[PDB]
């Protein structure tokens, strides 16, 4: 094609990620009159989500996805969007974002900074806690081996529940479960369902911890060269494809949980009173850490009303 871009993603062939990729590509495909190709490369085989993020600021990968939160790599304050509990729902998130002036902020130095240009923001899913023993209270995460993906928020969640974090890439998640080098994870139910994490755990808990937006990045090196009528195409399809992509989490998470019973996983709702009550030293430090950059980004987040 006139156009021949990639989608490279951690999520696999069986994801919600990927089937909104694909509708994605399918429309910009027929749009551009078959200008633009977009294929797509699923399971990490062009490295994790910060290697791709660098791809796309190089310009040798055009399309990827990251979480808002991710961007604490390089604006420590972005960790807000992942410190447990904070964001309520995806309402607070999708506001988060555009309408804080800590969002547009972030947004735009994606662009100058990052070399991305944000065309759509989706939801990805409420991080749950599966595990290889019941989880029916905050003790029984007390050294317990949870893997983490290699993300502070996540590594913090693990530490100050009291459980072991492990750091480990997610196309590794598989087989440390099987092998019960680790005990656990956390993720969505829907990546729990597409990578068959219930293959290999017989619990699942609902702590309810961290909220995943999806964002729909393209390098800067690729659409700079589009004519703006191609431009429009893309981002079109991106606005449109992130609204199947919420939905395609929004109906999962009606009807996973007797999903996994039909496979045999045993769900438990432990009391999250204390795991909200253990996360209060780990917003203090992150106020210690992030300053008043911080301090900010949380209070105009925390002023943010969930029911929409
Ligand atoms: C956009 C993207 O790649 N998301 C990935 C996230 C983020 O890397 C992590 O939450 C840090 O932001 O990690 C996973 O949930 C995980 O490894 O368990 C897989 C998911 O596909």
Not at 223 to 233: A, N, R
Request: without cysteine; hydrophobic residues 40%; proline residues 4%.
């Amino acid at each position: 094609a006139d156009y021949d871009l990639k989608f490279g993603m951690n999520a696999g062939t069986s994801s919600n990620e990927y089937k909104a990729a694909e509708m994605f590509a399918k429309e910009v495909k027929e749009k551009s009159q078959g200008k633009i190709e977009i294929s797509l490369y699923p399971s990490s085989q062009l490295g994790d989500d910060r290697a791709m993020l660098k791809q796309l600021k190089d310009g040798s990968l055009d399309f990827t996805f990251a979480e808002s939160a991710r961007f604490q790599l390089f604006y420590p304050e972005a960790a807000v969007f992942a410190l447990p509990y904070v964001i309520s729902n995806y309402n607070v998130a999708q506001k988060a974002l555009f309408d804080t002036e800590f969002g547009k902020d972030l947004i735009k130095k994606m662009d100058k900074d990052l070399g991305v240009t944000l065309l759509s923001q989706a939801y990805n899913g409420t991080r749950q806690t599966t595990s290889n023993r019941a989880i029916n209270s905050i003790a029984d995460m007390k050294g317990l081996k949870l893997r983490v993906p290699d993300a502070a928020t996540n590594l913090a969640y693990a530490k100050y529940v009291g459980a072991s974090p492990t750091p480990m890439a997610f196309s590794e998640v598989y087989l440390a479960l099987q092998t019960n080098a680790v005990d656990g994870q956390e993720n969505p139910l829907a990546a729990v369902q597409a990578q068959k994490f219930y293959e290999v755990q017989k619990f699942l808990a609902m702590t309810n911890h961290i909220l995943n937006d999806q964002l729909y990045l393209v390098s800067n090196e690729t659409y700079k060269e589009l004519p703006e009528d191609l431009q429009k195409v893309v981002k079109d399809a991106a606005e449109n494809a992130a609204k199947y992509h919420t939905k395609l989490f929004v109906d999962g998470e009606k009807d996973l949980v007797t999903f996994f019973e039909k496979q045999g996983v045993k769900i438990t709702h432990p009391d999250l009173v204390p795991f909200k009550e253990s996360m209060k030293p780990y917003y203090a430090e992150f106020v210690k850490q992030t300053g008043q950059k911080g301090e900010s980004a949380l209070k105009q987040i925390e002023a943010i009303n969930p029911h929409h």
